[PDB]
Amino acid sequence: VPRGSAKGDGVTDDTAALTSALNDTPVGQKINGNGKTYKVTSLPDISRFINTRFVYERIPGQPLYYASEEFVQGELFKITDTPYYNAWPQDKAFVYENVIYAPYMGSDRHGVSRLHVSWVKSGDDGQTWSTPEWLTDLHPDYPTVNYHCMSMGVCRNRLFAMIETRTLAKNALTNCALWDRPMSRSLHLTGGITKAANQRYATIHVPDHGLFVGDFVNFSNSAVTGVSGDMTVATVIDKDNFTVLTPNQQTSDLNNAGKNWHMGTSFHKSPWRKTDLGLIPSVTEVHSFATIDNNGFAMGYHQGDVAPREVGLFYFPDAFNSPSNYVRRQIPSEYEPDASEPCIKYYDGVLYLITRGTRGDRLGSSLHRSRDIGQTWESLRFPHNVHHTTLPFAKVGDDLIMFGSERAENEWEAGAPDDRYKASYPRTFYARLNVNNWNADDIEWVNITDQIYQGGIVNSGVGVGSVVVKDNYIYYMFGGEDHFNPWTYGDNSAKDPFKSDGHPSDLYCYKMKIGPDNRVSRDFRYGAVPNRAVPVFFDTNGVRTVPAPMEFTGDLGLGHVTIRASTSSNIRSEVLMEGEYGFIGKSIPTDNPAGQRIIFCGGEGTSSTTGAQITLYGANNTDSRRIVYNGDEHLFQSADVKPYNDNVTALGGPSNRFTTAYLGSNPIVT
Amino acid sequence: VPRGSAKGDGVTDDTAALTSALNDTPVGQKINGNGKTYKVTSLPDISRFINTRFVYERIPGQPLYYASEEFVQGELFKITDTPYYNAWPQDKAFVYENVIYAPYMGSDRHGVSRLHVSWVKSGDDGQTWSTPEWLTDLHPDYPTVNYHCMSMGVCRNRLFAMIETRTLAKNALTNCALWDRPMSRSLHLTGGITKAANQRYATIHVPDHGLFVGDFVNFSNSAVTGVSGDMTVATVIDKDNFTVLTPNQQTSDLNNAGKNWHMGTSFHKSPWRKTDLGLIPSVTEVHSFATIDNNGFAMGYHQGDVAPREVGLFYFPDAFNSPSNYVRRQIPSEYEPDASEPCIKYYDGVLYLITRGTRGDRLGSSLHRSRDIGQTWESLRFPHNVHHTTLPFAKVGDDLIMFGSERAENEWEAGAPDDRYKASYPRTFYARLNVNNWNADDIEWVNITDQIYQGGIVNSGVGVGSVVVKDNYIYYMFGGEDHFNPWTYGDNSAKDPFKSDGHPSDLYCYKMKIGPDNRVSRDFRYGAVPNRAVPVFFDTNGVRTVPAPMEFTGDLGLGHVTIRASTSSNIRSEVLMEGEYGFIGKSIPTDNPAGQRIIFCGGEGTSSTTGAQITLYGANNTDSRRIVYNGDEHLFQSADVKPYNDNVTALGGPSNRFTTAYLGSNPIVT
Amino acid sequence: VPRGSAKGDGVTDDTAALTSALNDTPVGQKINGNGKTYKVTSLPDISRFINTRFVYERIPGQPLYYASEEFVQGELFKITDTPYYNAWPQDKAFVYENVIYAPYMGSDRHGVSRLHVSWVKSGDDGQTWSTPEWLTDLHPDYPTVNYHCMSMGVCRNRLFAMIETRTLAKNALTNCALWDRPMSRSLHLTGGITKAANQRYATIHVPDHGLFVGDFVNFSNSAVTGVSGDMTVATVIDKDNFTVLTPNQQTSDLNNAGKNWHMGTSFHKSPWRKTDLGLIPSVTEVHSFATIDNNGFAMGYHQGDVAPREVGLFYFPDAFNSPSNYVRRQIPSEYEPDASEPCIKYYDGVLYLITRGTRGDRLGSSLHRSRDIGQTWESLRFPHNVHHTTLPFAKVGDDLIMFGSERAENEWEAGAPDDRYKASYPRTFYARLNVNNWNADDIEWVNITDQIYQGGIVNSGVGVGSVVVKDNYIYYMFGGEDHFNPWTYGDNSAKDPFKSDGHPSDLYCYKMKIGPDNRVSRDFRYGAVPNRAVPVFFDTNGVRTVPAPMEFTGDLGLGHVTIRASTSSNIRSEVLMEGEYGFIGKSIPTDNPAGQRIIFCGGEGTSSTTGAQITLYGANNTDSRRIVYNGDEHLFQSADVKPYNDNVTALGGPSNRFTTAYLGSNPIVT
Ligand SMILES: CC(=O)N[C@H]1[C@H]([C@H](O)[C@H](O)CO)O[C@](O)(C(=O)O)C[C@@H]1O
């Protein structure tokens, strides 16, 4: 009886052949699939294969693809590890001047409670990521409302973001504002600075500077008197020229033509420009960002609270001069039902838009392209009701490369019921779509990594991510959970991130190679002590030392404390108390309440021999509310020594007489 | 002359063939051993092989096996990195509701000094581990005695642990107590809550709840008035039903049948139940834990201080109703000499027990099985005097899979002398034993990873671990050192963990695949800033901010300090001082002792123009122990202004006269 | 038409064959180059190859070699991650008693501003590295001058370092000092301690102890009365014997011959010996270290500020007895132009020296060997003007194995212009040179890893490293940057490390296998919470607890603060203030300045019912600079109650009368 070998044609049922191969080969052998796709009736032991793809219909009629290691040149990274509920990179990621930015929201729930719009960044092409930065504070009217953001990107050297205000109670949109800020840059320039004689302003030529009046500018080596150090923009002449006010003037014209100098700019030292757009009607969320040109950009949106749904974009044609001016452009009406959260990108005059489907039992994600920034469209529906996921994407060559994640295991397929309230391993997929062929009928979703959905609450932080390309690599930044319960049902219904393991949602990044890498590897194993967040150095005395300024806002318990000399050429140690008032007090002692007191001393020890003392006795002290003032001089300066009340308290007593009183006149008795 | 190729039959001496292969192949080629075992006279360059096992008799007559990479599908992880002496997972590990727990003891030595029973946990199937948690405090009678634990596990949703009290002086057992606590869970339930009219209690049906009166229970969406939020168990009706006291009552019966709601429970908000077992006679250590059924469990023990040794278990048949009731069951007398620290597990009605051997020159580790919870046994001796290691294990199919580690290099073999006081690379092994065949004569110990033994002291934290299975993976959690000396012989005889590199012992986990993995990989490279232990966020001002509450118990030196508004709707900044009393004092200045003082000020600056001041002058000040009180009013409220002593001190002086005294009557002179 | 396959002979142009292979093979296939070298006209997609080397002439006539993964058995690690400018391991690395030391300088720039000579260490053969330790403090005359070090190593159990003093203004050398300190060790010894009757000193025989009078020595189990615990060296008899002063004496001689005991020594508890060498004439930098024998060592140097350059070494023949005595030895004059920073090592009576070339357009790095410690030399010039890099190296068998790094991409080659002020990926290379053949004409520089040069400033921290061998592995410790701009041109011209991402330079280590590894792998994935720098434990109350002493020197903002009982058998909480004086004050309130005050209280709350209070009112308070003293007794001890000034202020007032005054005599009125 002849045996069949594995065909790897994606049609022949290769299950038997693969089973025999696995049974007959040592467990440590890496079975090479030669880049082929093997149809199977169940997924085999995938870990024993390299360079293999499986096609499997978990639900009959719905083939999906599954990658062994090395089939794709790619790798998953964990990029945040914070107790906040860290999720929703959707759809904010971007690359600027070699740095990859992964913005997200860190909250305590699916909502705006405790929420900061945040980012982490990578300065090494995704191998390592920075300490989280808060981009927004808690709203001034917290806890009624707080901020929210799902649209962010860069246009002409400025960060632009749709900063929404939403209620804590219902996550209801109350306000939309466009916030923008110059990105930090160093510029190494030749010429371009002029300063007319007998006046104090200098004109700086920097093409497409993206700065506004009041923005930070720093100068080095200008060779133009007074154009030096930290300055600010005084005027903007046009998109390529601005002026600064110098502190001085010269009798001759200055011009640094042919001379090399340095600028830069600063995100942190420049204010946000905030443009109030009010409550934009018929909007649930603003989501995703497509830079159009040197003047403006589009942001996606949907309305999904009331029938009928809208999905589309807002185009801001000139966000620099007119940040309040935008035009609403909807996708075709047939694609709007059961749709939300469109991802938009612009390539070579084509605006591409991909929707999120809201139901597994109705037509789902659809793709649209426009050559007139959303006025007219060509459209396609993905087969099998793609739902619950956004599909962020980039265009590489003729392909859109899109990523998505089911929110819990076995939810991807059409007709698949939601599967919440239990731990599972949701699948993350990518797919390619050739824009010339414009047909998604035969799309191949390839499962490249699995995440964890914790199951302690109905909500999932898995997925809902964002995509960027840098060089020859594509990056999908997205959420994933772990098995640590937030104890919402349990001892942490208040959702305090700092109890137990906080919230399991954190960010991941799938880094996938999309073109040739013509350099030797930059990869390293990280073996360092992470020393950015709380920088520690063992000092020459052998004691851990943190030289960075820090803020501890949570309740602190301290042991023995020494306040070191720090202030005014280190002449003094200093504690400053804020608020309307400060309070320094004494707890009720647990074991000896009869001793309750604080001793304040001008010297080193509890013995009054070491310095003048004032001792405030607690109410619980045997000598209740006593004060003892103990010094070798008691000198009352600048004011009379008075009783608080009139004719109620005395000087001295029968058993505490003053020897005498030294007076400049007889007592005034009345 | 014909040449022989490598046979890979474990009997032919393949040394020559492998040497020739290595000499004739590029160093970067991975030489595939095709899953075979190759006999060699010395270990070759193992790093150049994949999928290869070597058999080598370092000591003639004692073959051991050595795995190249990829021979086993497995990986070593480092899971703690703490300055404490972190060792002894033995034998406490368990899996509960998808989380892997690795309990251990963190001390400063082989003993109970500075010791906390601790754990770390993994919520991602062993890829990453949590910040250590202390499960015990220092004993109330520290430093005479402290806690110790080598037996811990879960029975009916409760953690049970044998918490021992031992002397610091000699590590002598003084007390045994069974401590237990409900495990934290979220339950998503339908129906089961009833509340009779005109009374305030509700009955909660939760099968096998494992709760006692006083334990924490939280309710959400109960649809039963008053059964809501954080509550406690009022009564326990039976193993499946308990009651809670609500704050109210209704005129009709309530019953949430068919309605979906949520409970949970809390380890942290429930107290330990502590059952004092006294000093159990003839016990040195309680070690290892086997859940038997829904009612109870067994714990291993040995007595090894005096002849004769005992080894066996204590069976607690009903730990819920009768935690103080247990029965002692010994292994057969012939297996008790030179034996300790049995590992026990229960599978399909069979209790398996494996001993630690104490001597390399006497019969060592033995294996035992019982179908009557230790009343009768079948037994086997491992060949070659296995010693110094516990052999934690799990049963997978027909095999016991056991792990062990020599404590320093070249100690494993029978007759091998101890090799301490020098750095080395001890071997960790695993083996399989088929329970049907019940013969260890041909057992194959496979060296899968090597650890470091530091050598600065005789003791070793290497090994003495614990084993669990989760899904298709087995996990061996165990100790390992590094080359950093604790300086016990040196400048740290006190064994302070926070000097230099502290103690080199830390925990590792070998994760080994034991069955098919039918999902795409979950593996990631960790690229995040670890931000759980000290959660830091760069605030909108660019300053590192820690929002978590924290306790700093070690001596602190601080620079410039600002106490921010924090308390009573943020109206005030607040410092509270604990103890019987607080002391705020002033060090003797190094450079200008003549200035020693503290200035207390109601305003922002050292100038008295900014606020009222009191200045306490030190004894070293030129104006020794002076006090200057400087305000625009001095108002003495609630009491007379008196001298401390009678007729000793005056009001004013010849050069410090008060202008007059305003009195309601003439001075009383006596 | 026949097609040619890849020849892999390093001469045939294999570009076409490799292109066809890549086009015809699945992207996930690892193409095995079989350890051969393939000539190409451009680098192909290197990531798709294993065990392959390419030879490529980026600049015609200058072949360089490029390694795919697995061609070399090696791996890159990141070993620091700190906000300081971390660079210049050159040339200080060493191995001592199983620990790998990577010393470097952490500053804020190419200069001595904010600089500490620092190290990180590995106790696991390079897998993980320690928290940075500061070896030097800021110079006493900072900010005029500060320390600097590029030469460090070990001779007879002592660390020796050339600690330079340089100006912040120009990095100009002002002073050279030899600093030395005993290395920490534990010794397990038999016999050697004698103590003569009727006197208090004991003689300790420890061969080559390397200790001086005053150095720390600790004793355990000596079996010699009074030789116990922490002690110090009283006298040094000779290189093998020293004495200690015990606290007691006995009537009989003591001698612990045949008895096992323990010493050790301590780097941290012993002072530096500092030998001032003054401003050594004709020196720019001292760099690199070669241990010669049991008595001394050589250090490299160059002079490069003025013509003519010098390059050579200083030999200290007896650094123990005569640390101030050294001899200057130059390399041959023809090799001194355009040369600096020599690396020196000593093997089997041969001193090897390799220079750094300073120009790509002039003859570059050269290699020299001497059998008389630099009096005579044999020399060789590396082809193609190797420049901008030091070439640290070790000798393994007949080969020198050297490492170097271009400082920015495409600078390595002869004639290549500097390429700064833009981000790039500089190449790191190694090469072997057979010392018997003594010809570098055909040297093969192999690119094994690429780093990042950030480009925000002209300077680069890439490279300038150090090399050590431990066992069968060689380690190159060196600098690398990331894409995070330091904002020198921008908002951080002051170069504060603790703003934003600080400085991008950090240390890396390339670990390369250089001989057989005859043990099973020690490798692990690091999955622990790093818990050495700021050791955190969740206490039994669920709160993060740090038990280590710590120093916070940066400005701190604190929220609610509790000072716990800590001092004098935990009777009191304690705050001590340093400096000439302490200041506790109150900020001007933002919202209610009219309330500005501090309430000091002997009790737990703001209500005076809880304890005695003194309230200091701010100048901004409605009751400006008021003081209210509120207690149930006001007792003035040890001194008269006086006004500060004479006959200016009163006791009481018309609306604040004291009831009376209790006096021992009539008022003295004048
Ligand atoms: C915060 C604060 O100022 N507390 C003060 C209170 C309030 O002024 C009072 O309760 C009205 O609210 O009264 C005093 O107790 C008092 O009269 O003895 C002292 C105390 O310092």
JSON list of N, CA, C and O in Angstrom, two decimals, chain C residues 250-261:
[
{"chain": "C", "resi": 250, "resn": "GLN", "atom": "N", "xyz": [48.08, 36.16, 75.61]},
{"chain": "C", "resi": 250, "resn": "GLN", "atom": "CA", "xyz": [47.99, 34.86, 76.26]},
{"chain": "C", "resi": 250, "resn": "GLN", "atom": "C", "xyz": [49.38, 34.45, 76.74]},
{"chain": "C", "resi": 250, "resn": "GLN", "atom": "O", "xyz": [50.38, 34.93, 76.21]},
{"chain": "C", "resi": 251, "resn": "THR", "atom": "N", "xyz": [49.44, 33.58, 77.74]},
{"chain": "C", "resi": 251, "resn": "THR", "atom": "CA", "xyz": [50.73, 33.17, 78.32]},
{"chain": "C", "resi": 251, "resn": "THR", "atom": "C", "xyz": [51.48, 32.11, 77.49]},
{"chain": "C", "resi": 251, "resn": "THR", "atom": "O", "xyz": [52.66, 31.84, 77.75]},
{"chain": "C", "resi": 252, "resn": "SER", "atom": "N", "xyz": [50.81, 31.52, 76.51]},
{"chain": "C", "resi": 252, "resn": "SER", "atom": "CA", "xyz": [51.47, 30.56, 75.62]},
{"chain": "C", "resi": 252, "resn": "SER", "atom": "C", "xyz": [51.42, 31.02, 74.16]},
{"chain": "C", "resi": 252, "resn": "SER", "atom": "O", "xyz": [50.54, 31.79, 73.77]},
{"chain": "C", "resi": 253, "resn": "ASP", "atom": "N", "xyz": [52.39, 30.55, 73.36]},
{"chain": "C", "resi": 253, "resn": "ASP", "atom": "CA", "xyz": [52.41, 30.80, 71.92]},
{"chain": "C", "resi": 253, "resn": "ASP", "atom": "C", "xyz": [51.20, 30.15, 71.27]},
{"chain": "C", "resi": 253, "resn": "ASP", "atom": "O", "xyz": [50.75, 29.08, 71.69]},
{"chain": "C", "resi": 254, "resn": "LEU", "atom": "N", "xyz": [50.67, 30.81, 70.24]},
{"chain": "C", "resi": 254, "resn": "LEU", "atom": "CA", "xyz": [49.59, 30.25, 69.43]},
{"chain": "C", "resi": 254, "resn": "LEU", "atom": "C", "xyz": [50.03, 30.10, 67.99]},
{"chain": "C", "resi": 254, "resn": "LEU", "atom": "O", "xyz": [50.79, 30.92, 67.47]},
{"chain": "C", "resi": 255, "resn": "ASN", "atom": "N", "xyz": [49.56, 29.03, 67.35]},
{"chain": "C", "resi": 255, "resn": "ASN", "atom": "CA", "xyz": [49.90, 28.71, 65.97]},
{"chain": "C", "resi": 255, "resn": "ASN", "atom": "C", "xyz": [48.79, 27.82, 65.41]},
{"chain": "C", "resi": 255, "resn": "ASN", "atom": "O", "xyz": [48.56, 26.72, 65.93]},
{"chain": "C", "resi": 256, "resn": "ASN", "atom": "N", "xyz": [48.11, 28.28, 64.36]},
{"chain": "C", "resi": 256, "resn": "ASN", "atom": "CA", "xyz": [46.97, 27.53, 63.81]},
{"chain": "C", "resi": 256, "resn": "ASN", "atom": "C", "xyz": [47.32, 26.57, 62.66]},
{"chain": "C", "resi": 256, "resn": "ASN", "atom": "O", "xyz": [46.45, 26.22, 61.85]},
{"chain": "C", "resi": 257, "resn": "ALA", "atom": "N", "xyz": [48.58, 26.15, 62.60]},
{"chain": "C", "resi": 257, "resn": "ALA", "atom": "CA", "xyz": [49.03, 25.18, 61.60]},
{"chain": "C", "resi": 257, "resn": "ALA", "atom": "C", "xyz": [48.06, 24.00, 61.50]},
{"chain": "C", "resi": 257, "resn": "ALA", "atom": "O", "xyz": [47.62, 23.46, 62.52]},
{"chain": "C", "resi": 258, "resn": "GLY", "atom": "N", "xyz": [47.70, 23.65, 60.27]},
{"chain": "C", "resi": 258, "resn": "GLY", "atom": "CA", "xyz": [46.80, 22.52, 60.01]},
{"chain": "C", "resi": 258, "resn": "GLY", "atom": "C", "xyz": [45.32, 22.80, 60.23]},
{"chain": "C", "resi": 258, "resn": "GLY", "atom": "O", "xyz": [44.50, 21.90, 60.05]},
{"chain": "C", "resi": 259, "resn": "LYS", "atom": "N", "xyz": [44.98, 24.02, 60.61]},
{"chain": "C", "resi": 259, "resn": "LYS", "atom": "CA", "xyz": [43.60, 24.39, 60.87]},
{"chain": "C", "resi": 259, "resn": "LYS", "atom": "C", "xyz": [43.05, 25.27, 59.74]},
{"chain": "C", "resi": 259, "resn": "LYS", "atom": "O", "xyz": [43.74, 26.18, 59.26]},
{"chain": "C", "resi": 260, "resn": "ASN", "atom": "N", "xyz": [41.83, 24.98, 59.31]},
{"chain": "C", "resi": 260, "resn": "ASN", "atom": "CA", "xyz": [41.18, 25.70, 58.22]},
{"chain": "C", "resi": 260, "resn": "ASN", "atom": "C", "xyz": [40.48, 26.95, 58.72]},
{"chain": "C", "resi": 260, "resn": "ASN", "atom": "O", "xyz": [39.72, 26.90, 59.69]},
{"chain": "C", "resi": 261, "resn": "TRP", "atom": "N", "xyz": [40.73, 28.08, 58.06]},
{"chain": "C", "resi": 261, "resn": "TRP", "atom": "CA", "xyz": [40.14, 29.35, 58.46]},
{"chain": "C", "resi": 261, "resn": "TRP", "atom": "C", "xyz": [39.84, 30.22, 57.24]},
{"chain": "C", "resi": 261, "resn": "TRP", "atom": "O", "xyz": [40.11, 29.81, 56.11]}
]
